[PDB]
């Protein structure tokens, strides 16, 4: 169960602007059940240590899943032109090695569907692992 | 024996259920139980150790009684 409550929120969490501070990050890591006790390195060391939404999410994502979805508002003239692996609007999702590299999540990426990172998690990682992935997202 | 060498999830459920019921009714544990005092947990340990003393009649649809030892069936 991933209801609207934590789907809008995960689209806002994984936007490119979500920079979490140190106390906020530690607060969030208290609610990861599948956390290995290691604080990731910040995306931004100087001037201020400042994590990102995609870092804490890539901590949620289980195992070493690989996935490439495409966020809902992706311009279709992007894959052809330049910026195809850059994506100025952050609309192409690439979970590579269990780790959100780019792209905003939504239900297209987190529902159950063809692709649908949670589906690839159920297929690749297991069945209790995706239970934990659901509850951790929430 | 013309049958899937894997243990069906239905077979796994029924083996663990009956094994834990036996253990609850004083059947001797066949695994080095450490701190475990719950039938079902002991049944899972006994299964993962390949030591549950049970065999299965897989009844084919003609009537063949295919005998499989729970320690032979490839389990998850």
């Amino acid at each position: 169960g991933i209801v609207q409550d934590t789907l809008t929120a995960v689209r806002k969490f994984t936007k490119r602007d979500v920079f979490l501070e140190r106390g906020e990050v530690m607060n969030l890591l208290m609610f990861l059940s599948t956390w290995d006790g290691k604080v990731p390195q910040p995306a931004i060391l100087k001037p201020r240590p400042l994590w990102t939404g995609k870092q804490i999410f890539s901590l949620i994502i289980p195992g070493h899943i690989n996935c490439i979805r495409t966020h809902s508002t992706h311009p279709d003239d992007e894959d052809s032109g330049p910026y195809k692996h850059i994506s100025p609007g952050d609309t192409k999702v690439v979970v590579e090695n269990g780790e959100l590299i780019m792209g905003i999540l939504c239900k297209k990426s987190l529902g159950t569907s063809a692709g649908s990172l949670v589906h690839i998690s159920y297929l690749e990682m297991g069945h209790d692992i995706t239970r934990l992935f659901y509850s951790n997202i929430q | 024996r013309i049958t899937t060498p894997y243990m069906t999830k239905y077979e796994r459920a029924r083996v663990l259920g009956t094994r834990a019921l036996q253990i609850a009714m004083c059947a001797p544990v066949m695994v080095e139980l450490e701190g475990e005092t719950d039938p079902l947990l002991i049944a899972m340990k006994e299964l993962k150790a390949r030591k549950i003393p049970i065999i299965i009649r897989r009844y084919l649809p003609d009537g063949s009684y295919e005998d499989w030892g729970v320690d032979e069936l490839i389990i998850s």
Partner: protein, 148 residues
């Protein structure tokens, strides 16, 4: 050392496509003396950048300037090695792609190395002779500093 790359860039653009995000802006830079293109997402709230600034990019594989590798875990205390803190901006990312203009026959003369600092993407695109320290899935450090 550990410096995969280093140069002085000049910002020719800040948001050509128009600002998509409020705290993050996308510099389009061109270097000096290496004939190299850079595209870089920057947190312009904590580190403001505008047109025509000349900053000094350095891309390293470690911060310790003795060569010893990083282990990639937040350790804010240890200074047993002396960090490369001559820089104002320091991001930490992972090279996630290295394209090139190679054809089936020859090798690539120009390369494009794409890095993603926790989600803020950079694309460093130039000659294949100085973009050769990079390799996919390599964790890398970007250190910028404006020049006066």
């Amino acid at each position: 050392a550990g410096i995969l790359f280093e140069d002085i860039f000049d910002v020719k653009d800040i948001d050509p496509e128009g600002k998509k995000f409020d705290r993050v802006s996308r510099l389009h830079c061109e270097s000096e003396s290496f004939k190299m293109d850079l595209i870089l997402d920057v947190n312009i709230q904590i580190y403001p950048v505008d047109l025509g600034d000349k900053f000094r990019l350095v891309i390293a594989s470690t911060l310790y300037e003795d060569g010893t590798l990083d282990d990639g875990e937040y350790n804010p205390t240890d200074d047993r090695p002396s960090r490369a803190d001559q820089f104002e901006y320091v991001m930490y990312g992972k090279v996630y792609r290295i394209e090139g203009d190679e054809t089936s026959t020859e090798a690539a003369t120009r390369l494009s190395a794409y890095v993603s600092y926790g989600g803020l993407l950079m694309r460093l695109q130039g000659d294949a002779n100085n973009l050769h320290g990079f390799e996919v899935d390599s964790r890398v450090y970007l250190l910028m500093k404006k020049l006066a």
